[PDB]
Design a protein around this ligand. Structure first.
Ligand SMILES: COc1ccc2ccc(C(=N)N)cc2c1-c1cnn(S(C)(=O)=O)c1
Length: 245
């Protein structure tokens, strides 16, 4: 997250921190995610498509720092990794960039809701907020495009939703962004998601309820003029999400 503010997981309790074990024992951060139901986390297929082996992945809930065991966190392995069957990656644009990870503790259990661990509600069909609506993002991604390290502490920021026809203008993304994708950015281009934030939540308060409207997917640069963050539009995928869970 470029700019924004440092935060802690009690403000973001549906946020999943996903890591990968490498041959030889080293572990590194991979992508964020969101808890949809006790046994199910949703993220982006691009985070896993090159290493599609469920056994390589560690999922934490209730964790606030990249290298510290926060009081009250739980650790999980992946029972099932489900990648969307029609996913593809163009130059910029990612297509059907959604995935489900069925989670399980070493004792065989799903998550147990607590003060630092909670689900986020999914959207309803044909019901997204209007362009101009403020929404929040969370992640452990880069603070600056020229950094190679990620922040130790969880960050968050707020951005505004942008219409399909504005995001399809020539200096934005043209015909590369489709009706299955949602654009959001800072009007002043000073804050955004960046590398390392992928798969994480775009949450919008809609008719009173906090809703998982988007999933961090792709962008040109970070916090660059006329280049919004692009998000997987969750409401399009309600039939897929339903049948695979
Ligand atoms: C692998 O990088 C990624 C991966 C996913 C992204 C998702 C959203 C956004 C965004 N701007 N909202 C940027 C992203 C970048 C991304 C775009 N360029 N930069 S950087 C650090 O300048 O190379 C990284």
């Amino acid at each position: 997250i470029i700019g924004g503010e440092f935060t802690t997981i009690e403000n973001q309790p549906w946020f999943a921190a996903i890591y990968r074990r490498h041959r030889g024992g080293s572990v590194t951060y991979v992508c964020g995610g969101s808890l949809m139901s006790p046994c199910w986390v949703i993220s982006a297929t691009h985070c896993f498509i090159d290493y599609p082996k469920k056994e390589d992945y560690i999922v934490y809930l209730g964790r606030s720092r990249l290298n510290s065991n926060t009081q009250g966190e739980m650790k999980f392995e992946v029972e099932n990794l489900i990648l969307h069957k029609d996913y593809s990656a163009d130059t910029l644009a990612h297509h059907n960039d959604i995935a489900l990870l069925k989670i399980r503790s070493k004792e065989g259990r799903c998550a147990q809701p607590s003060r630092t661990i909670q689900t986020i509600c999914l959207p309803s069909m044909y019901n997204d907020p209007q362009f101009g609506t403020s929404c929040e993002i969370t992640g452990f991604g880069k603070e600056n495009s020229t950094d190679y390290l990620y922040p130790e502490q969880l960050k968050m920021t707020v951005v505004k939703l942008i219409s399909h026809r504005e995001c399809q203008q020539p200096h934005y993304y043209g015909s590369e962004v489709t009706t299955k994708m949602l654009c959001a950015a800072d009007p002043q281009w000073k804050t955004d998601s960046c590398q390392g934030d992928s798969g994480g939540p775009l949450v919008c308060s809609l008719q009173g309820r906090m809703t998982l409207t988007g999933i961090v997917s792709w962008g040109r640069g970070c916090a660059l003029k006329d280049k919004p963050g692009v998000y997987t539009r969750v409401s399009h995928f309600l039939p897929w999400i339903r049948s695979h869970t």
